[PDB]
Design a protein around this ligand. Structure first.
Ligand SMILES: *[C@@H]1O[C@H](CO)[C@@H](O)[C@H](O)[C@H]1NC(C)=O
Ligand SMILES: *[C@@H]1O[C@H](CO)[C@@H](O)[C@H](O)[C@H]1NC(C)=O
Ligand SMILES: N[C@@H](CCC(=O)O)C(=O)O
Ligand SMILES: N[C@@H](CCC(=O)O)C(=O)O
Lengths: 749, 750
């Protein structure tokens, strides 16, 4: 039974993890040098300072009854029975111990049955904030509620929306990881895997956790809520698998340079959080002057000396060469622990609470009067401990952050320091790269990352909106971008839909433009051909115009011939109207013009077969003006739900079949009557032109066989329909020119 | 603070949830009628039976020091403080602990004083660890098997998407963790994981119910909460008109009037309860209990006033009794009896092994040490059940971890007489799930569709990919490549379709489709023209043979007329070969004969001009010269295989001859020779006036027939339907009219 028992008027309990967990077979093995010895000596240093003070408990000596918890709650509970043995043996006014959350909770469950106030220096579990279960409990450190929120902001700062969580079973890891999940949901942070390590774990068990973390390579960031010993095994396990992770740990890791023993390659680039605290200058001198020969009140100091310095003291030669006794704790090998001022504040908080209690229950005497002979834990905690307010004992700032006080839940103020593990100057060390005081403020300009830059931890590759549309498979963190049809634009991010028929998506696909491409063109490859024949044929009409009055009386042909010459002129310009790209109002003129061109030419030819002649020809064209009269302004686009989706052509789609039917009926009637009427009746005039006009009439039926029959099939194309129209019309006009060729050649010859 | 104490040489402790925990103004409120009072009375009955059993502790009378935990762990610790206060009436062992947290706290307190503890209702798997609880025994199965039973129940009904809610503490957390582990071992997904706190308010319960309702794809809710938490959740569901398929643990069990206070919200709930049998002796003992003669129970008056509402000290609670009203035993009564009897048997064995002479407590046993008892007689005990039925074989024994055998029963909370809600057993679980589907009135086919819970419904095999990143909770299937055959994994197609689009939609088939060839379904027109030409030339040839070439045929040479008959005859036959399917034996003739068809017709016109016997033979040899080019082209055109498919409109194969693609090149060469010959004769002559005029009509007819072919060619452009084969028939049909027009007036007036 190793313990520290200093006599005094008032005895304060103590619970520190001097010894670590141990390898199962033993209750506790190796000495915890940083978090078990420095904290233990910090309490002794604070007690000596209090006993030397005149304004804090004058004339009353403070004793200590410090016990070792061996970093386990089962062994701590047995030790904690000594604090309550007298109440069932020294009288304990209060307990300053409690480092692990599991240890503190188990002790608090027993201390509340005997009304013993307890102040913790390292337990940050949010479960201890409940004042209905742990009535007599207080702490100088904030709960894990703020710590879990602080790391969530860090993940959001780097947009690490796909991370993994590794925790440890107990009152700290399980409670802390629960708060992290709640904070992660509000920031759209998704968890890949959730692994938990146990108290009774082997190296193979730890490698199983590492292998599970490697099953999802997209999650390069691991969030750790573990104890000091549990984190050491996982880092060592990760060193045997050549696995690199971005470690984001809680205060369990902190800036402790004892977890990383020969495993700095995997822990490099880690982001660890440590509570905001300042080193105590007075404690630095006190700890660097302790020796195994002069320090006799600490039974664990000799074991600490034989481990840190690896020299024997019992027989002076047990493990290595004799201890030279010329070595001592110095700044070369000594670094002050982070949670040192918290231990000092916890000791001073109990001392100050008793000082206020002593000045009330003992109004006159400066010693322990009869009123305080039987201390009441309920009055000390609720009336004096919870309403305490004093400045830090050893503080160099004297700011508002140096005030030691407890809130309504008996906790501290949330202030965390962000640390980064990096290799600078050839050695491995920590460095503060941020601070969290109700607001995140990092120092990314001086952060050394893991491989060469900020790691990317996202579930899904972020797909550009050029052709890909996000589709959630049922979750809110991962998604799959399956492209949709190229003629549909995405609305904002998740839905691509068609904006009706006849539109094309924009360059950014945030909207859809109207289809600009059109099949109409001017002076193109498909239009130069038909127009070339048309102009030459049109100029041929002018040749007949030239021989109008120069040779009129001399020829015996003489105005039916002149009427048909002007009639076929409308056919020539009809070809030019057909090839015109726009059709705002001329499409109705095209059917009226080209349709009447055949009627005038055929009627004039029929008239020649047989004043009055002009009236009959005009009568046929008179009724052709109002055949349809159903307007021509709107042209329906031929684009539909076809594969093209990129071209629009109107071509005056209104009344397309009506023109063909009317033309066919008129053409069929004229050819039958004209051929029958002429035949071979008498062969009058200079030459037998009665058969000649029949030849022209017969050829026009073949030309009529190119108007209707070859059309209505494959004529839906804009280019094909126009080219076929002018060729058929121009061929008919050229045929009529052949009829007038014979009178023309007779004059020449 | 009431205490139940009895005299005796050995005093056994007790902890029961007599009172239910209240709000902040009171530690505990209403009396737990079924789970605290009945269990306390069962322990008292077991102690009374042991005190009168000559075989078990004949000379030692067993006392009792029983306390009420008020369903709180802190209150339980406060009560158990006086259990160890005397050690600093001595306690040789406590028969107590119903809730897992209460038992854990009591064991933690007692391990410092070496006091054995045997639980009767705590089923938490955390207590099975002997490193932290060195003196804890238990007569009930742990949750390690209840999780397996619930996972098997969920897997039986294809429930792969469920929501879970558990109570915060020591029972809910371990149970839900074990259930999640067993559900990950099988194929079960978890949608929502909610928690129920100790100080949980009604608004928080409404929020939890809303969160559960936020997942419509998870209609099955897994419960790992306590009795009060389950009752509050049921009330919240009832007041929100929420319907769920509850799957609860032993915390709910078969509690009729305790948890199911809102009948209608839970009508198809499946509850798992530890297997147990009724005890007739305990029922008789309990039914005879009255508030007058039962003065040793301080909490009996409150239970009477609660179950039989009335007022004492007012002559009101003196008419009713516990016999007339129906009585239902708590399921965990035989477990309490077994725990008490196991403690008594361990004490008897210790007395026999330490006091072999006297039947009372000898000096070697007066200090009772818990370590030796627990390590020797408590763990290594084996005896038959004190009040087991006749047709059974049950033994009370502890395993290496001090637990029980994992045997469970399955219950459903159905309605029998349209309002008479009750619990009915539908199965059990010892090593595997044996459920009775017909006994559950929501799973039979006649009762309606089975309530299933899946994240994504299974889509049709056709047009589905089911993209899944690794192992995922649910899948999303999208149509992909309608020309692909089939696939059941991430890849769009498991097999390569190739040139054959998709498949029969039943898997990998890759069945071929019809090529560009097609039967004469719409080719009657080409056939009709051939018949008309054949009929027309039959009469033309008939009159020539009948007249013996006398009247007009023997005008000048009488040789061109015979040659002209052959040309028209072969033109009609060209339509039949062109409309046939291209094969290795017929496809070769179309290319070679194309040039010959125009050559023979042009030769007759050329021969007539040359004439204006020997000339006919020379003309026949001249026609053979043009056929040589066809044969020369046929050297490589005759073997034709391949296809002209395109990456569009995969429904057509477009497979034809290699010469078919090259037929355009062959046709261009053939058309060149025919055009030049026809135009030369017409211009040169521009003999008999009638003969000269007739030649002019034939010369112009041949040219106009070929000229009209060009506009038609652009219309088709190898459309594969009414394609270039159509115009080849038309020009051949027009050529027949051209040949007929030559001899049309020769015999018209004869
Ligand atoms: C991602 O984090 C970086 C800060 O390192 C910054 O770009 C921004 O805050 C986040 N979002 C995007 C889109 O970059
Ligand atoms: C689904 O449940 C039914 C029984 O109701 C049965 O088919 C089987 O147990 C389950 N699985 C499948 C694939 O059907
Ligand atoms: N924050 C840790 C304590 C870490 C330490 O300082 O040892 C806990 O709550 O258990
Ligand atoms: N076995 C469950 C419920 C016990 C009961 O109250 O019936 C527990 O440990 O809390």
């Amino acid at each position: 039974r190793r313990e520290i028992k200093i006599e005094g008027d008032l005895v304060l309990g103590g619970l520190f993890p001097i010894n670590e967990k141990g390898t199962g077979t033993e209750e506790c093995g190796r000495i915890n040098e940083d978090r078990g010895i420095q904290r233990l000596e910090a309490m002794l240093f604070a007690i000596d300072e209090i006993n030397k003070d005149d304004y804090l408990l004058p004339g009353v000596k403070l004793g200590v009854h410090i016990l070792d918890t061996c970093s386990r709650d089962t062994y701590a509970l047995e030790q904690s029975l000594e604090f309550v043995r007298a109440s069932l043996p020294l009288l304990i006014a209060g307990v300053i111990g409690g480092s692990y959350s599991s240890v503190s909770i188990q002790v608090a469950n027993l201390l509340r049955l005997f009304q013993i106030p307890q102040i913790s220096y390292a337990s940050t579990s949010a479960k201890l904030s409940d004042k209905s279960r742990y009535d007599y409990f207080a702490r100088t450190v904030p709960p894990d509620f703020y710590q879990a929120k602080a790391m969530a902001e860090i993940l959001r700062f780097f947009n690490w929306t796909y991370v993994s969580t590794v925790a440890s079973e107990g009152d700290y890891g399980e409670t802390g990881i629960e708060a992290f999940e709640q904070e992660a949901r509000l920031r759209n942070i998704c968890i890949a895997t959730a692994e938990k390590v146990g108290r009774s774990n082997i190296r193979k068990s730890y490698d199983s956790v590492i292998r599970e973390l490697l099953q999802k390579p997209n999650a390069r960031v691991v969030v750790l809520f573990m104890r000091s010993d549990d984190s050491r095994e996982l880092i060592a396990a990760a060193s045997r698998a050549n696995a690199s992770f971005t470690w984001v740990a809680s205060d369990g890791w902190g800036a402790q340079e004892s977890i990383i023993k020969g495993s700095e390659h995997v822990a490099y680039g880690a982001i660890t959080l440590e509570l905001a605290s300042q080193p105590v200058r007075q404690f630095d001198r006190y700890f660097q002057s302790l020796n195994p020969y002069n320090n006799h009140r600490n039974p664990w100091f000799r074991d600490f000396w034989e481990q840190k310095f690896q020299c024997s003291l019992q027989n002076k030669r047990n493990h290595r060469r004799v201890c030279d006794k010329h070595l001592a704790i110095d700044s070369s090998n000594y670094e002050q622990e982070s949670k040192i001022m918290f231990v000092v504040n916890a000791v001073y908080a109990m001392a100050h609470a008793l000082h206020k209690m002593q000045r009330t229950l003992c109004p006159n005497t400066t010693k322990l009067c009869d009123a305080m002979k039987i201390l009441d834990g309920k009055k000390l905690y609720k009336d004096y401990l919870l309403k305490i307010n004093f400045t830090a004992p050893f503080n160099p700032n004297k700011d508002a952050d140096s005030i030691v006080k407890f809130d309504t839940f008996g906790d501290g103020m949330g202030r965390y320091n962000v640390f980064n593990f990096q290799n600078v100057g050839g050695k491995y060390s920590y460095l503060k790269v941020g601070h969290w005081a109700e607001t995140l403020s990092l120092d990314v300009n001086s952060i050394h990352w893991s491989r060469n830059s900020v790691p990317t931890s996202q579930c899904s590759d972020p797909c550009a909106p050029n052709e890909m549309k996000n589709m959630q498979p049922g979750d809110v963190c991962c998604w799959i971008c399956i492209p949709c049809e190229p003629y549909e634009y995405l609305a904002d991010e998740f839905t691509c839909m068609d904006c009706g028929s006849g539109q094309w998506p924009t360059a950014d696909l945030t909207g859809c433009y109207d289809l600009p491409e059109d099949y109409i063109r001017w002076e193109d490859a498909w239009a130069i051909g038909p127009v070339t024949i048309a102009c030459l044929g049109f100029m041929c009409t002018c040749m007949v115009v030239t021989v109008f009055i120069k040779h009129n009386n001399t020829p015996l042909v003489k105005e039916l011939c002149y009427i048909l010459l002007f009639g076929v002129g409308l056919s020539y310009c009809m070809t030019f109207f057909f090839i015109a790209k726009p059709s705002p109002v001329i499409c109705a003129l095209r059917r009226l013009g080209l349709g009447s061109s055949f009627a005038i030419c055929y009627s004039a030819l029929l008239t020649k077969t047989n004043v009055f002649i002009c009236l009959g020809l005009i009568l046929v064209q008179i009724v052709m003006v109002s055949v349809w009269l159903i307007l021509e302004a709107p042209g329906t686009r031929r684009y539909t739900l076809a594969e093209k989706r990129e071209t629009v052509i109107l071509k005056c789609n209104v009344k397309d079949s009506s023109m063909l039917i009317s033309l066919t009926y008129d053409v069929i009637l004229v050819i039958l009557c004209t051929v029958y009427a002429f035949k071979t009746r008498k062969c009058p005039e200079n030459f037998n032109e009665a058969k000649f006009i029949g030849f022209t009439m017969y050829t026009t039926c073949i030309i009529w066989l190119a108007f209707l029959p070859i059309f209505y099939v494959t004529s839906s194309d804009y280019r094909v329909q126009t080219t076929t129209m002018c060729i058929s019309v121009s061929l008919s006009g050229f045929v009529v020119l052949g009829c007038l060729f014979a009178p023309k050649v007779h004059i020449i010859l | 603070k009431k205490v139940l104490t009895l005299e005796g040489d050995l005093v056994l402790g007790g902890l029961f949830p007599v009172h239910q925990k209240g709000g902040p103004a009171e530690d505990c409120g209403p009396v737990n009628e079924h789970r605290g009072i009945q269990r306390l009375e069962a322990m008292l009955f077991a102690l009374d039976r042991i005190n009168r059993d000559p075989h078990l502790l004949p000379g030692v009378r067993l006392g009792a020091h029983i306390l009420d935990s008020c369903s709180k762990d802190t209150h339980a610790l406060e009560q158990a403080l006086d259990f160890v206060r005397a050690s600093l009436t001595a306690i040789t062992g406590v028969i107590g602990g119903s809730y897992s947290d209460v038992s854990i706290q009591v064991a933690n307190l007692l391990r410092l004083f070496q006091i054995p503890q045997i639980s009767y209702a705590s089923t938490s798997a955390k207590l099975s660890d002997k490193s932290r609880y060195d003196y804890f025994a238990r007569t009930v199965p742990p949750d390690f098997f209840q999780a397996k039973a619930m996972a098997e129940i969920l897997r039986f009904f294809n429930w792969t998407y469920v929501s879970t809610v558990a109570s915060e503490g020591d029972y809910g957390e371990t149970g839900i963790e074990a259930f999640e582990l067993e559900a990950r071992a099988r194929n079960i997904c978890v949608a929502t994981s909610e928690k129920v706190g100790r100080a949980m308010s009604r608004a928080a319960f409404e929020g939890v119910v809303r969160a559960l309702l936020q997942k419509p794809s998870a209609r099955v809710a897994v419960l790992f909460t306590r009795s009060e938490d389950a009752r509050e959740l049921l009330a919240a569901s009832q007041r929100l008109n929420a319907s769920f398929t509850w799957v609860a643990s032993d915390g709910w069990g078969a509690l009729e009037s305790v948890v199911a206070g809102s009948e209608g919200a839970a009508e198809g709930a499946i509850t798992i309860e530890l297997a147990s049998y009724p005890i007739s002796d305990f029922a008789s003992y309990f039914q005879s209990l009255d508030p007058w003669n039962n003065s040793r129970n301080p909490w009996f008056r409150e239970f009477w006033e609660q179950r039989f509402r009335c007022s004492f000290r007012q002559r009101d609670c003196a008419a009713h009794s516990l016999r007339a009203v129906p009585f239902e035993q708590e399921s965990k009564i035989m477990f309490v009896v077994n725990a008490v009897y196991a403690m008594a048997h361990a004490l008897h064995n210790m007395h026999r092994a330490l006091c072999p002479n006297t039947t009372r407590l000898c000096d070697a046993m007066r200090p009772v040490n818990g370590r030796r008892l627990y390590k020797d007689f408590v763990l290594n005990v084996k005896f038959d059940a004190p009040f087991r039925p006749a047709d059974t074989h049950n033994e009370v024994r502890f395993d290496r971890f001090g637990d029980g055998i994992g045997r469970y029963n399955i219950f459903t909370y159905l309605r029998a007489g349209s309002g008479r809600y009750r619990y009915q057993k539908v199965g059990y679980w010892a090593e595997g799930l044996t459920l009775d589907t017909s006994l559950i009135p929501w799973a039979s086919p006649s009762a309606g569709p089975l309530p299933a819970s899946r994240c994504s419904e299974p889509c049709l095999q056709n047009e589905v990919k089911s993209v899944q990143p690794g192992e995922v909770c649910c899948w999303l299937c999208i149509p992909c490549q309608p020309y692909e055959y089939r696939l059941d994994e991430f890849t769009c197609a498991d097999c390569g379709l190739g040139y054959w689009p998709n498949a029969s939609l039943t898997g990998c088939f890759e069945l071929p489709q019809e090529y560009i060839r097609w039967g004469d379904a719409w080719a009657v027109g080409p056939v009709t023209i051939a018949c008309l030409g054949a009929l027309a030339t039959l009469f033309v040839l008939g009159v020539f043979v009948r007249h013996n070439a006398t009247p007009v045929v023997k005008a000048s040479g009488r040789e061109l007329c015979y040659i002209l008959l052959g040309g028209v005859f072969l033109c009609y036959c060209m339509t039949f070969i062109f409309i046939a399917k291209p094969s290795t034996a017929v496809c070769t003739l179309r290319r070679l004969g194309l040039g010959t068809a125009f050559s023979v017709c042009y030769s007759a016109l050329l021969t007539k001009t040359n004439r204006i016997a020997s000339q006919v033979a020379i003309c026949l040899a001249l026609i053979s010269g043009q056929l040589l080019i066809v044969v020369a082209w046929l050297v490589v055109e005759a073997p034709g295989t391949g296809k002209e498919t395109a990456p569009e409109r995969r429904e057509v194969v477009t497979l034809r001859c290699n010469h078919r693609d090259a037929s355009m090149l062959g046709s261009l060469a053939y058309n060149v020779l025919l055009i030049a010959l026809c135009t030369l004769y017409a211009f040169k002559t521009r003999e008999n006036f009638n003969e000269a005029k007739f030649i002019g009509f034939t010369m112009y007819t041949t040219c106009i027939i070929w000229l009209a072919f060009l506009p038609i060619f652009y219309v088709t452009s190898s459309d594969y339907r009414v394609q270039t084969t159509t115009m080849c028939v038309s020009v051949s049909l027009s050529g027949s009219v051209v040949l007929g027009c030559l001899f049309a007036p020769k015999l018209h007036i004869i």
